[PDB]
Amino acid sequence: LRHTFVVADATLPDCPLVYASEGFYAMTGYGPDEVLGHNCRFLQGEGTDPKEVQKIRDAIKKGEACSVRLLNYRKDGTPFWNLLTVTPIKTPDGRVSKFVGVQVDVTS
Ligand SMILES: Cc1cc2nc3c(=O)[nH]c(=O)nc-3n(C[C@H](O)[C@H](O)[C@H](O)COP(=O)(O)O)c2cc1C
């Protein structure tokens, strides 16, 4: 329940984040001045499995929900495991307006 939440704008090509919960900032070490307006990929690094990343990339392309485990890094460079679940939010016309994401640090 110590999960975090963010919102990405799907009307912009690179799904930049337009909102992040208090927790997301505190957990990652990053502040709004460095996350808002940017694609969430900045949390990835050397150990991030490119196959899981591809999985999210493809789901977003198709406007579908996706859940994957990714190794992410805090602002100080330290690693942590993030169980990410992305959900598309559509307008009545069927087009995708936003992407919602729930991040859970499952490092245990
Ligand atoms: C709403 C939302 C939240 C995301 N949260 C994270 C995250 O916490 N960590 C991460 O590594 N990637 C996260 N992503 C994945 C990247 O933002 C991006 O969708 C993905 O890496 C696409 O592949 P690409 O970087 O190869 O273009 C999120 C994506 C969306 C749409």
From Swiss-Prot:
Residues 1-63 form the PAS domain. FMN binds at residues 39-44, 57, 72, 82, 103. The modification S-4a-FMN cysteine is found at residue 40. Autophosphorylated in response to blue light irradiation. 2 molecules of FMN bind covalently to cysteines after exposure to blue light and are reversed in the dark. It is found in: Membrane. Residues 64-108 form the PAC domain. Expressed in gametes, pre-gametes and gametes generated by pre-gametes (at protein level). Belongs to the protein kinase superfamily. AGC Ser/Thr protein kinase family. Protein kinase that acts as a blue light photoreceptor. Required for non-photochemical quenching (NPQ), a mechanism that converts and dissipates the harmful excess absorbed light energy into heat and protect the photosynthetic apparatus from photo-oxidative damage. Controls the energy-dependent chlorophyll fluorescence quenching (qE) activity of chlorophyll excited states by inducing the expression of the qE effector protein LHCSR3 in high light intensities. This is Phototropin. It comes from Chlamydomonas reinhardtii.
